[PDB]
C-alpha cells in the first residue's frame, strides 16, 4: 500500500529517492565507482601503445581464433586487449605502435563470440584501419 | 560577446520506424506525382501541416467566447485562406483538421508552373524554375518550394530575359547560329 495523503510529499520523495539506488543503471551511473574502474574513465575513444598480438578463442558453439592486440593506454597507463575489426587488419599493426581504440558497442560488455574483451581498434599509427583495408591509404614509412 | 543571432530551427521530422512498406510507397507516390528531389521535402510539408494541426487542436480546447481563441483562430484561418488550401465557405477552425499533404503540395511553384501549362511535365517545371525562366509579379524566382499566394496566382510569366520568353537566344542557339 502507498500513502496518498495531501501531506505525504516528503515520505513519497524520500522513498522514491532512496529506492532509485536498487536500479542497476542509476547506481552504476550516479555513484562514482564505475568511472574509476572503467579503463577509459568516461571517454568514448582512448589512445595506447601495442604490447603484443594475441589469438583469443571463440565461445563453445563455434570455434575460431579471433586476432587481438594487448595495448597499454596513455592517460592511466593500464593494460587492455582490443579486437582488430576486418579481415587481415592484424598484418597492418606491428608491436610498439600508437593505436586509437573505441568501445565495442554494448556499453562496456562482451561480444557474441570473443570472451573478456570490451574494446576494438579504430586507428593504427594515426591512419584509419578502414582506409588500410579498402587501400585508400598506405601505412606511413 | 558578438552582435549575431543563433535563432536556427529544424524544418523536418524523420519517421519513427526507418523501413516500413505502406509508408515508403505513400512518400514515393507524393515524390512521383509532384517531382520532389528527396523524402526530406515530403517530411518538411508533413512537419508544417502537423504544426498547423497542433495549433488548431490546442485552440479548440479553449471556450468559444475567449478573445485569444477568436483572434488566433481568425488569424490562422485568414493565412490558410491567403495561401489557398481553403475557401470563404469552409473557413471554420474545425475544418483545419480535414486538410492533408496533397492540399499543400498543390501550392508549390513547380506544381502551379506545370498546372498552368508553362511546362509540359512536372519534372520540366522544376528545371524551368531553377534555370531562372519563371517569374511571379515582376520578381524572377528560382525556388521550387516557393508556396504561391491565392491572389498572386493569376500572373506567373516567363521572365523577360529568358530565351523562352524574353527573346534572346542562349549559348546552344548562339553557337549553332555562328556555325550555321
Amino acid at each position: 500500500g502507498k500513502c496518498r495523503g495531501l501531506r505525504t510529499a516528503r515520505k513519497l520523495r524520500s522513498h522514491r529517492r532512496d529506492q532509485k539506488w536498487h536500479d542497476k543503471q542509476y547506481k552504476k551511473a550516479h555513484l562514482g565507482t564505475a568511472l574509476k574502474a572503467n579503463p577509459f574513465g568516461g571517454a568514448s575513444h582512448a589512445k595506447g601503445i601495442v604490447l603484443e598480438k594475441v589469438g583469443v578463442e571463440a565461445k563453445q558453439p563455434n570455434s575460431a581464433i579471433r586476432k587481438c592486440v594487448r595495448v597499454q593506454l596513455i592517460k592511466n597507463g593500464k593494460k587492455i586487449t582490443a579486437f582488430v575489426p576486418n579481415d587481415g587488419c592484424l598484418n597492418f599493426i606491428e608491436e610498439n605502435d600508437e593505436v586509437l581504440v573505441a568501445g565495442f558497442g554494448r556499453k562496456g560488455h562482451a561480444v557474441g563470440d570473443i570472451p573478456g574483451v570490451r574494446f576494438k581498434v579504430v586507428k593504427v599509427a594515426n591512419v584509419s584501419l578502414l582506409a588500410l583495408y579498402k587501400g585508400k591509404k598506405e601505412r606511413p614509412r | 560577446p558578438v552582435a549575431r543571432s543563433w535563432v536556427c530551427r529544424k524544418t523536418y521530422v524523420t519517421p519513427r520506424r526507418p523501413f516500413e512498406k505502406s509508408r515508403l510507397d505513400q512518400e514515393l507516390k507524393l515524390i512521383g506525382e509532384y517531382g520532389l528531389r528527396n523524402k526530406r521535402e515530403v517530411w518538411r510539408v508533413k512537419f508544417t501541416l502537423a504544426k498547423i494541426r497542433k495549433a488548431a487542436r490546442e485552440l479548440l480546447t479553449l471556450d468559444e467566447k475567449d478573445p485569444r481563441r477568436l483572434f488566433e483562430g481568425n488569424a490562422l484561418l485568414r493565412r490558410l485562406v491567403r495561401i489557398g488550401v481553403l475557401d470563404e465557405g469552409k473557413m471554420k477552425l474545425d475544418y483545419i483538421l480535414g486538410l492533408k499533404i496533397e492540399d499543400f503540395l498543390e501550392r508549390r511553384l513547380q506544381t502551379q508552373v506545370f498546372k498552368l501549362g508553362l511546362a509540359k511535365s512536372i519534372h520540366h517545371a522544376r528545371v524551368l524554375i531553377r534555370q531562372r525562366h519563371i517569374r511571379v509579379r515582376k520578381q524572377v524566382v528560382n525556388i521550387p518550394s516557393f508556396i504561391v499566394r491565392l491572389d498572386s496566382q493569376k500572373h506567373i510569366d516567363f521572365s523577360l530575359r529568358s530565351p523562352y520568353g524574353g527573346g534572346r537566344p542562349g549559348r546552344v542557339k548562339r553557337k549553332n547560329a555562328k556555325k550555321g
Binding site: 603484443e52 589469438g55 578463442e57 | -
Partner: protein
C-alpha cells in the same frame, strides 16, 4: 590417408601432460613446450591421447600457443621415423 612430410610453418610435437579443457601443452621437436589448441574438426571426431605424435600449426605472432592440425598413428609415426624426426621414439 597418405603421408604428410609438411614442415612449412608447422612443427611435429610429442603430447605430454594433456591437461586442460582443450589445452594440450605438448613438447615440440625443434623448440620448447607450447599450448596446442584442439582445432574444430578434432573436438569430438578424432581423439588425441596422453602420449601421441601430432603435426601442430605453429601460429607465429605470440608463439606461446598453437593449434593441432593432424593426429598420427603407429604406421605413419614409424614412416616419419624413417625420414626426418629425431631418434626420439614413437
Amino acid at each position: 590417408r597418405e603421408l604428410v612430410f609438411k614442415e612449412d610453418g608447422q612443427e611435429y610435437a610429442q603430447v605430454i601432460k594433456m591437461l586442460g579443457n582443450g589445452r594440450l601443452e605438448a613438447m615440440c621437436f625443434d623448440g620448447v613446450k607450447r599450448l596446442c589448441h584442439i582445432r574444430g574438426k578434432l573436438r569430438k571426431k578424432v581423439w588425441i591421447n596422453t602420449s601421441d605424435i601430432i603435426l601442430v600449426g605453429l601460429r607465429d605472432y605470440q608463439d606461446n600457443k598453437a593449434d593441432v592440425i593432424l593426429k598420427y598413428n603407429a604406421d605413419e609415426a614409424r614412416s616419419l621415423k624413417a625420414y626426418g624426426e629425431l631418434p626420439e621414439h614413437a
